[PDB]
Amino acid sequence: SVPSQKTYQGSYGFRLGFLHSGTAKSVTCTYSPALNKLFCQLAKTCPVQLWVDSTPPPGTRVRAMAIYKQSQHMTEVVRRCPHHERCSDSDGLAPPQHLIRVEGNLRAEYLDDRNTFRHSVVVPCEPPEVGSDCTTIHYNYMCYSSCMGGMNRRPILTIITLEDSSGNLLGRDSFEVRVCACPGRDRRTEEENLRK
Ligand SMILES: CN1CCC(Nc2cccc3c2cc(C#CCNc2ccc(C(C)(C)C#N)nc2)n3CC(F)(F)F)CC1
Ligand SMILES: [Cl-]
Ligand SMILES: [Zn+2]
């Protein structure tokens, strides 16, 4: 079964935000608003901002899940490739098959859905730190988009869901992801492509 990707702000006005990191050759993560697409390097920090108009209840959580963007691939579970699932690089929380990890949160939980076999990672959410206006989650993507036998050059979306403590939907947003060696050049190219 395919989870919904429909944007849904919900009662709390939930939506994502991204830093403005530019497209320099050295950038490790960069987001294209024009493409709604995040470009990032393998296993590097990807900051994703969480925004709401009003604070949801304590016990609200935020889940990330990858799905293939193309129609003929969306029912296939997005997972790490045969090489990376075997490279013994788990931090002790993330199963080695999971593409998306959360960096720097010991309360991250990883789900293998018993019915759909899809992977997700979920963390508690908290109000912003003093002097900040949003919360930030640090994600890591653990395969390249080009990894053969995994994503296999197929585009993916990350679906971010705001959930109550039972897992019921409160909000949903999403963005395309390319995991690549030079995010800055690839963002410029695809943006110049779109422009042409
Ligand atoms: C004008 N107002 C606009 C919205 C601003 N608040 C936010 C702005 C941006 C992000 C925000 C928030 C709030 C949350 C959150 C949560 C859920 N947990 C949680 C835990 C503990 C507690 C307390 C009360 C301390 C306890 N006990 N209350 C909630 N988040 C994260 C989320 F939901 F977006 F992921 C505040 C000002
Ligand atoms: Cl930018
Ligand atoms: Zn891989």
Residue numbers in the entry: 96 to 291
Could you share sentences copied from the article?
pmcThe tumor suppressor protein p53 is a critical transcription factor that regulates cellular responses to stress. More than 50% of human cancers harbor mutations in the TP53 gene that encodes the p53 protein, and most of these are missense mutations occurring in the DNA binding domain of p53 (amino acids 94–292). Rezatapopt (also known as PC14586) is a small molecule reactivator of the p53 Y220C mutant and is being evaluated in clinical trials.
As the lead compounds gained potency, with SC150 values reaching below the 100 nM threshold, X-ray crystallization studies confirmed the binding mode of the lead compounds. The crystal structure of compound 10 complexed with the p53 Y220C mutant protein was successfully determined at 1.70 Å resolution. The p53 Y220C mutant protein used for X-ray crystallization trials consists of the DNA binding domain spanning amino acids 94–312, which was stabilized by four additional mutations (M133L, V203A, N239Y, N268D). The X-ray structure confirmed that compound 10 binds the p53 Y220C mutant protein within a central cavity that is created by the tyrosine-to-cysteine substitution in the p53 Y220C mutant protein, with the indole moiety occupying this space and the trifluoromethyl group extending deeply into the hydrophobic pocket. The 4-aminopiperidine ring extends toward the solvent, and the alkyne linker allows the aromatic ring to reach the adjacent subsite. This enables a favorable CH-π stacking interaction of the aromatic ring with Proline-153. Our molecular modeling predicted that the side chain of Threonine-150 within the p53 Y220C protein would form a hydrogen bond with the ligand. This interaction helped to orient the ligand in the binding pocket of the p53 Y220C mutant protein and enhance other interactions such as hydrophobic and van der Waals interactions. The trifluoromethyl group had a favorable interaction with the sulfur atom of Cysteine-220, also reported by Fersht et al. for the carbazole series.
